[PDB]
Design a protein around this ligand. Structure first.
Ligand SMILES: C[C@H](c1cccc2ccccc12)N1CCC(C(=O)NCc2cccc(F)c2)CC1
Ligand SMILES: [Zn+2]
Length: 312
């Protein structure tokens, strides 16, 4: 018997295929799904006629389309994306404080913090799978975006994860092509030195939560002797992300865009997100509390930027 169905790896280009009556889908299409339903080992029915199956890039056309959509060559990627989607599609995405958040499940609080921060930054993704899923996320349909974050970060539903590390992976697919950071390492003796950073390191800094501190000078146990200071001479980007091991830190209105706090120890703990609106909002998955000032164990802080150049 002859039956007509569609395959795809990007949900955008569908390919008409003629499936054989007898055999299942795995020895015909390889690994195959149908609405997150691993029917690789399931025989073809007849209500199938006309419907669309996901598959793995078996041939040059599918591999090229997968690459164009996802911007990865990783052969495990699509399977990993699928098994995450099975779960994330069961998560809830309420609107909290004007933003799409995520109701706690499967230690997804780090993901909620990543999702909340991104919505407040002037940032776009170059990979079409990310830009499309993100558009939908901002509108409350975030299951796909979350599964994609997991897949790009090499993380699995149910693991706790680190927000900074996650952003490190995601921002490699962000519109950073024009971002630029110039730092100066100065010394009492040693000498004078300038460093230019681009891509991810133009916007991500690890070692202080304070953007002011990076502007006035941050100190470090030097390589030739005593006390090197690092100071920002120039910044070109729409935001910066300052991270540090969690530490007691006061967040005041009008001084930052948003932040993550982390309570617990390295192995096990809990993130919440703080954003500065008419007052401070602390968004803890589905829950909201409000406060005029916060002091607690902050670990990332986001600040708005356009262009900065130094006075030193
Ligand atoms: C922000 C926080 C963090 C980031 C950077 C330095 C830290 C030092 C002490 C405590 C926390 C620190 N960070 C948050 C997420 C954490 C995480 O992913 N834990 C999962 C895990 C599970 C099992 C073992 C393990 F080491 C870690 C890993 C650490
Ligand atoms: Zn030096």
């Amino acid at each position: 018997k002859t039956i007509k169905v569609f395959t795809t790896v990007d949900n955008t280009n569908l390919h008409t295929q003629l499936v054989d009556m007898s055999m299942t889908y795995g020895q015909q299409f390889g690994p195959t799904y149908l609405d997150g339903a691993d029917v690789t080992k399931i025989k073809p029915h007849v209500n199938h006629e006309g419907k669309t199956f996901f598959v793995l890039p078996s041939d040059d056309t599918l591999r090229s389309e997968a690459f164009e959509y996802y911007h990865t060559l990783d052969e495990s990627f699509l399977g990993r994306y699928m098994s995450a989607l099975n779960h994330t599609k069961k998560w809830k995405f309420p609107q909290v404080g004007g933003l799409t958040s995520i109701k706690w499940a499967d230690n997804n609080c780090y993901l909620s913090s990543v999702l909340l921060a991104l919505q407040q930054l002037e940032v776009k993704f170059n990979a079409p799978a990310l830009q499309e899923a993100y558009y939908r996320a901002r509108a409350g349909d975030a299951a796909n975006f979350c599964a994609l974050i997991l897949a790009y970060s090499n993380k699995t539903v149910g693991e706790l994860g680190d927000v900074r590390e996650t952003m490190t992976h995601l921002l490699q697919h962000a519109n950073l092509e024009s971002a630029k950071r110039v730092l100066n390492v100065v010394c009492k003796h040693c000498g004078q030195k300038t460093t230019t950073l681009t891509g991810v390191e133009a916007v991500m800094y690890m070692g202080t939560l304070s953007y002011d501190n990076l502007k006035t000078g941050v100190s470090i146990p030097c390589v030739c002797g005593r006390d090197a200071t690092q100071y920002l001479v120039q910044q070109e980007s729409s935001f910066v992300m300052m991270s540090a091991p969690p530490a007691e830190y006061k967040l005041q209105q009008g001084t930052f865009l948003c932040a993550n706090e982390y309570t617990g120890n390295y192995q096990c703990g809990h993130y919440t997100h703080i954003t500065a609106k008419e007052t401070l909002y602390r968004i803890d998955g589905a829950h909201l509390t409000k406060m005029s000032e916060y002091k607690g164990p902050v670990t990332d802080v986001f600040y708005k930027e356009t262009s900065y150049t130094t006075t030193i």
